[PDB]
């Protein structure tokens, strides 16, 4: 009927329309209740209990509460109350299409189920999206609010996933290019997803949250930068940015990419991967589908959360017994164990291609140390990840403008030397993570003597724990003493 | 092998003795983190996605920490590393016997589905902690941290469930205060209520009135009637009171939401109509009812709020019923709220009398117009029993407190000693009433059915009457 | 000129329009940087060190926020950015004139000093404030923001004061009326002052708010009652009232009345008494003013502040040894010994006007106990405290008006009966604490011997320690036993 | 034995020994209730009212518990009741020391005042520590609690100041080091005394803290290193540790170094080397001094707060009229106006000599454009501020020793190169902010020409608002184009 209040642990009472009420109160949105904003990380920091659901409305709250100060501040932006509209839409459901355990399914399980598709959860949420809108009657209601559904329900979905291929846009012409600046910022990764985040995953996870996205609205103007309308931050703000990106490497570095949590998605995936065949989900028609193809219809997807664990977990099917054994061996905390850690030195730099030969190449070091068990390939995981300020190599500072106190429409750069010496010089690194799947000492004991081999072989870098856990290896190379 | 630390986000960094570690790896305990800890309360107040794991990791570290402040003040009690891990053990083990959506089950789900069992989620844990210890070989590992598993494990259920002249077993009257930490029977003051106030209002948004730490730092054991019992300082009596207040606010902002209650009540009816094709196997491969695996532990075990989602997503036609209240959940299409009442002066409603309710509002004769008629199972009547803990009883009344001049010298504190704008009862119920028919003109008439009802039994006046039923009001002189 | 912003830790950023920035750089607002809070409390709660100043700052965006929500829900109020400004200045400076260590001064010094005077900080302020406006030249520049200085000024002195003085207000009309809620309410007590500083000084005490006053405000709307408009409450959030009053309560009972606060606020006021003939203030044209009557002239009083204390600490005029030892003894902590506390029961109310016959009271008693001292009416010290509130004895949730979310304009009353059975019957009480200014251990028990035997013959309550305090008096009285 | 519960809004409940409580009960201690933790910053966030006295509490507490937390870790080292005791007194006092406005007085006064003496708030603190003992027979109380005056008074006085000069500590000996890594540690910059300020300074300022001390604590071990036994970290612990001096940077940057906060004391500074010679503070045997040799005597230095700031505002002495006067345009905002902001580049590095020859660099340049103004030497003020991780431009993590899961009791180093490529290049830099005293329109445009020019003819860093602030100025550098 009219507008709902939310309390949110993050944000306080936040307002909803009645137009994402309707929205929101679909099994669509809904399933979103049921898939762990962190995945594995939950098994590692016992608070992380939080769900896609109330991050969602967050990022819908934050995108109006951007909209809105800059309509505010900025009258001649012409920002209408159905602009607003459309960009908390966008925010509420730029996470639809999220699969089960979120980045974990994206990232790490269809990849390798289904190597030929290539999927991202954006796209999900597009399909998604359209699915919601369809299946709810949402259009006629659009309409009573004062939006134009063909121009609208396009507008959202490019703001979820960029341009649906000279101004590019079909939702919105140039004048309103800021507009695509909020969700989703495919030009710098400033956007309202990520503040939500930073605020929800620390008050979660336990960890402190250094960025204040009040003070970047306050501070946020649009101006003309080449013939394009962006949102600027003001020029002494910068540092506060570099400080944002910090934050998102801290929360990547600790939680994100816990070696624990890593350990426990890899799991997960593997009993996915030996459930994918079994496990049946209805779509539309009665039509059956796999836990790997039911990204190919939204009926069967609405209905593919975090519950799948449960259904392994519990089930008596003799087809599904490995599977199920693995998620109980995550129960009982018998998870592969951590061997080490190393990253590539000077401008080396491992290629997605060469990942999967990278169990062999440890396993094919010879340590000269007297073992009692000998390790093959398939006994070693090699984990790669890519630690970066969201741009690659880039320096995402590079790609914010800034305006002065004097000037508030005139936009200018920011150059790094500008800002600090005390700066990052680099903006992209890997870290490499080795496991073993045997668990006895023995195992483990041999498994640390092959990898700081490997490490000498590949000429990485020492391992930290090096001298204590391959006292044997280390004095090899020079390098390192 | 040293200990395990683990970051909560309530108490911050947790240290985790190796035996604990041993207990929570198992999939008695790893249970927990499938049933949330508010159950229907996520449905209304987005940030209570917690689960019972969490609680229980709090309720082991706070009981910890009481034990280990009273053994450091208090050296004469010989409080050894043995009783403080039997301790924790307990505070980690007392919610074991939770089932799917927390308190729903053991006070909506089993009470319907089958009345002439009589259980509680600590009976549950009880039985739950037995059967984890059984499973898993912990006993060898208990003898090996300086635990004797027979008197210990005794002490453990004794501190979750109770009593099975000296009632107990596990620890000698010389031990007494032990009993309250985990669960305090005698005034409702222990550990487990700390944790769930500074949880939940970290994840529900509400901020959190009562200070735990300052409570500890205040306790001492003193001798009261023969027996060792944790006292508090005399000053503090204020600070206890308020404790209270906070488990009632707690309870009307958030445990008793009128939405989340309704949500409760849609959940636990899908679950009844659910009950008799949801099938969950227990030990030797025989099969258990929703209602029934509370009677084999292994079942119990896998059963959590995954069985929401199973009647959710299932295509059988038979739980066509169940799937339909679910969805129509997703989509919030819940029954609504008609309004509130209380009963005036003495009056009380047994839970025997709860069945015939619906029936008589329907019965009541309003003097108006209305385009529908309604009946006894259009309405839900939710009756809510709001108290202090102990049921009419002041709590303070149970509590023994200590003066700064004469720190072993237990003393008691009257309510008029305190405080004259403190609460004059400690119990009190609410009625709530809501419709199953969701139409514009079905919940007009409910709302005048309703306020007849009220005036009818000399309830209160709901506080919108004069604006959701304008033409009944003023029959009743006492409201105006 | 366009807003500066303020980073505040409890609300965070803070727009201030350049009129208030004018208001709050002048000598008599930033007096209030001054002047602690809470007085003697700091001398308890260690992190109770803030000022008047950041509380005024937080009172006027407070202010300022509920009438801006008022007027964006209901636009046919007609609140103008006029009106807006007028709220905000008046919630900025209705602290202006409190004096050294806030209630104190106004509480404790000047009824002793001053005592055929009737004075009210709410009076320095309205002083202070017309001070400030012609000091500072402020007329003009309230003229170059659209305010009427004439109606205007008189408006937010009512708002501090109330009727200067059928319709009782000449800055505002009666369609305004809901306007003369917000920053000081004289009807039910429920306004912003309160609203700050039970935030402020709880995360300075290290004491948690139970109170949110953001949710009040999404749910406060106009409606008219009794031919007035009046800030309404929602029907469901009457509990959320009952229990800001609570708050309130418990924030008196632990901080602002606690028994060593209260002590040190005794001490530090008979230490200014005895201070007040020697310490001189300049004040308008030259002339001189006591501590005493700073309040008679506004130039005088801007240079009345906490550092009063610290004058009289460091001073080495011998006419200033009295005080000047008084403080000393605070910094060694040598302070007044609390003998104990007890209420009066039934009826019985202590006068004002009784407060001094009281030690004699006391030292009047005969406890028939082997007493190796004999004590006198000046060892005793008899603090009488009044909790209540707000409004005396009666219930302030009477004097509130509600809505229900099916007719929003239409206000209704709320009984006690109507909301719980669990509330308090009474709504005043005093309380009773006795201390003696003798410190030695056999002064100390005497003391304890008088102080429960005058409870005795009073009626009064029982002592809590009255058992263990003495033991040999307690039995005579019955109703303890 | 009783010990004293304060309620901090930092710690919460802290315990107090006996001991400590009459450490704290002296006017030696009871001054730190006077002066600002952050000075001039309170007069930029109105939060950052906190007082020396709390932190005090503050670093006292955690000294306590990691002292502690190694002893029930480690019972090998033997650590007494005795040590425990010495930590926290030590923790306790190392800000006795401090003067008006905390930083401002060692950083900027003291230098400006008295050029010849070399002084630290550190040698105040145990020269106050020692009139605090002796004033108030302590010594005897010492010994009650077991207590080795002799050795013990130097132990503490050894812990705030180094060696008061192989072995190099007289208080304990070898076995012991770790003790001397607690309250200060000069060898890496890891103390409690920062762990408190984070935590407090953003409580009240209204930043969010990213550092966890805790967890610090938890992971700290003593280990042997070159046959010194010393804390320390565990390896995986080594990014908490490079984001822990990225947040000590961070709250420099943001609020400790805000460029109001220091032109607030840039000019409080001013105010009081203009009263210096007409304040007169007494000393020991009636003896006078001034603010600036009140550091020779600790009587006087008793007597020396924030209170001066007061006493000299509200002095009528027409001696006292030029420092009164520059304190009056502190209350009516009239500041000295921000230029802008600007670095050296590659090895460029200003020495403390050359600060006083800066503001005649700037006036001497020569800009060349249309200026209604002329501006002269002392219209500019330049302050030259070091950030830096705390040990100039070494990399503090280079002196911390770290332990493996493995071997508790080996421990190990760690390299930059082993941690991150993200991590800084540089520990130290040089920021350069520029001031005019002149404050009207024209002076300002001017300044901001001169400044801009300067910065093109040192080879400094573009300022970030230059291309608005000086167009005509910043296309003749290359470099900035
Ligand atoms: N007293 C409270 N304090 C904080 N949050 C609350 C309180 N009561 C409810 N909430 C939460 C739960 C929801 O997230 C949100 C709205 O709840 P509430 O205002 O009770 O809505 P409702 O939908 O039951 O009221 P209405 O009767 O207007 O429909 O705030
Ligand atoms: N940097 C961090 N800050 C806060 N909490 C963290 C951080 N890293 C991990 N945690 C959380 C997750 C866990 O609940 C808890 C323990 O994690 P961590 O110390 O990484 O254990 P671990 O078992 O992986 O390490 P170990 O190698 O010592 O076994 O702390
Ligand atoms: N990085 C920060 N994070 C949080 N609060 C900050 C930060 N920097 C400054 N503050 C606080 C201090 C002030 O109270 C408030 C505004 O400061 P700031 O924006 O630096 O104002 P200013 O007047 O110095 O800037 P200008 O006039 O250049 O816009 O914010
Ligand atoms: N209810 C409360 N909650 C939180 N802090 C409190 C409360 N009451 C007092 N405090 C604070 C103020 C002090 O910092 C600290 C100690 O207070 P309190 O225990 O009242 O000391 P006290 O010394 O007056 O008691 P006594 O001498 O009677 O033991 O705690
Ligand atoms: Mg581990
Ligand atoms: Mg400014
Ligand atoms: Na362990
Ligand atoms: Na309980
Ligand atoms: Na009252």
């Given at each position: ?6 309390n949110?642990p993050?944000?306080?009472?936040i ?9 929101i109160?679909?099994?669509?949105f809904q399933?979103?209740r ?6 594995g ?8 209990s939080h769900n896609?659901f109330?991050?969602?409305?967050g990022?819908?709250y934050?995108?109006?509460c951007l909209?809105?100060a800059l309509?505010?501040?900025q009258?001649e932006?012409?920002?209408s ?8 839409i966008?925010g509420l459901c730029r ?6 355990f979120s980045?974990?399914?994206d ?10 598709v290539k999927?991202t959860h954006?796209?999900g949420?597009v399909m998604?999206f359209?699915?919601l ?9 659009m ?6 559904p ?7 979905k490019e703001?979820?996933?960029?341009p649906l291929?000279?101004?590019?846009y079909?939702?919105?012409?140039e004048?309103?290019s ?9 030009r710098?990764?400033?956007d309202?997803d ?6 929800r995953?620390c008050?979660?996870?336990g ?6 996205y009040?003070?970047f ?6 101006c003309?930068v080449?013939?394009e309308?962006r949102?600027c931050?003001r020029?002494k ?6 400080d944002?990106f910090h ?6 570095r600790?939680?994100?990419q816990?070696?624990?949590?890593n350990?426990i998605?890899?799991?997960?995936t593997?009993?996915?991967?030996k459930?994918?065949d ?11 589908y796999?836990?790997?193809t039911?990204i ?5 997807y609405?209905?593919?959360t975090?519950?799948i664990?449960?259904?392994?977990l519990?089930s008596?099917?003799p087809?599904?017994?490995?599977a ?5 061996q995550?129960?009982?905390?018998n ?5 080490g850690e190393?990253?590539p ?8 291609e ?10 094919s070091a ?6 009692d068990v000998?390790?093959?390939?398939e006994?070693?995981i090699?984990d ?8 690659q190599?880039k ?6 403008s800034?305006?002065?106190?004097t000037?508030?429409?005139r936009?200018?750069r920011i150059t ?6 005390l700066?990052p ?5 890997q870290?490499?993570?080795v ?5 006895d ?9 092959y990898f700081?081999?490997?490490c000498?072989?590949?000429?990485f ?5 090096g001298?204590?856990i391959?006292?044997l290896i280390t ?7």
């Amino acid at each position: 009927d009219t507008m709902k209040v939310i309390n949110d642990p993050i944000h306080g009472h936040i307002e909803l329309h009645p137009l994402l009420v309707r929205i929101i109160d679909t099994p669509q949105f809904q399933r979103l209740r049921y898939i762990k904003q962190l995945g594995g990380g939950y098994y590692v920091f016992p608070g992380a209990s939080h769900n896609r659901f109330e991050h969602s409305l967050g990022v819908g709250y934050l995108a109006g509460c951007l909209v809105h100060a800059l309509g505010e501040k900025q009258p001649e932006l012409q920002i209408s109350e159905r602009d607003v509209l459309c960009v908390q839409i966008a925010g509420l459901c730029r996470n639809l299409g999220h699969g089960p355990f979120s980045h974990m399914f994206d990232g790490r399980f269809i990849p390798l189920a289904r190597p030929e598709v290539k999927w991202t959860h954006e796209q999900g949420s597009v399909m998604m999206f359209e699915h919601l809108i369809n299946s709810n009657g949402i259009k006629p209601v659009m309409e009573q609010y004062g939006l134009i559904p063909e121009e609208d329900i396009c507008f959202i979905k490019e703001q979820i996933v960029g341009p649906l291929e000279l101004w590019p846009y079909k939702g919105r012409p140039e004048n309103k290019s800021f507009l695509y600046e909020i969700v989703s910022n495919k030009r710098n990764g400033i956007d309202v997803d990520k503040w939500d985040y930073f605020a929800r995953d620390c008050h979660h996870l336990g960890i402190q949250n250094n960025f204040d996205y009040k003070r970047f609205i306050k501070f946020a103007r649009v101006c003309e930068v080449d013939n394009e309308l962006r949102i600027c931050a003001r020029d002494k703000e910068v540092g506060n940015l570099y400080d944002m990106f910090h934050t998102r490497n801290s929360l990547h570095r600790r939680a994100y990419q816990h070696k624990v949590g890593n350990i426990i998605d890899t799991m997960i995936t593997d009993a996915f991967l030996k459930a994918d065949d079994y496990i049946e989900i209805t779509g539309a028609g009665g039509k059956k589908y796999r836990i790997s193809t039911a990204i190919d219809d939204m009926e069967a997807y609405t209905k593919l959360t975090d519950n799948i664990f449960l259904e392994i977990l519990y089930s008596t099917d003799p087809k599904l017994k490995d599977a199920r054994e693995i998620l109980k061996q995550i129960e009982y905390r018998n998870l592969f164990k951590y061997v080490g850690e190393t990253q590539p030195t000077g401008q080396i730099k491992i290629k997605r291609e060469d990942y999967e030969s990278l169990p062999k190449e440890v396993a094919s070091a010879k340590p000269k140390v007297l073992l009692d068990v000998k390790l093959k390939a398939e006994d070693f995981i090699v984990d790669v990840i890519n630690m970066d300020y969201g741009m690659q190599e880039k320096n995402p500072i590079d790609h914010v403008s800034f305006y002065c106190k004097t000037a508030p429409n005139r936009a200018i750069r920011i150059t790094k030397n500008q800002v600090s010496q005390l700066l990052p010089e680099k903006f992209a690194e890997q870290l490499i993570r080795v496991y073993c799947k045997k668990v006895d000492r023995k195992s483990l004991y041999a498994a640390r003597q092959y990898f700081v081999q490997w490490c000498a072989d590949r000429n990485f870098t020492k391992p930290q724990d090096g001298d204590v856990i391959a006292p044997l290896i280390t004095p090899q190379k020079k390098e390192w003493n």
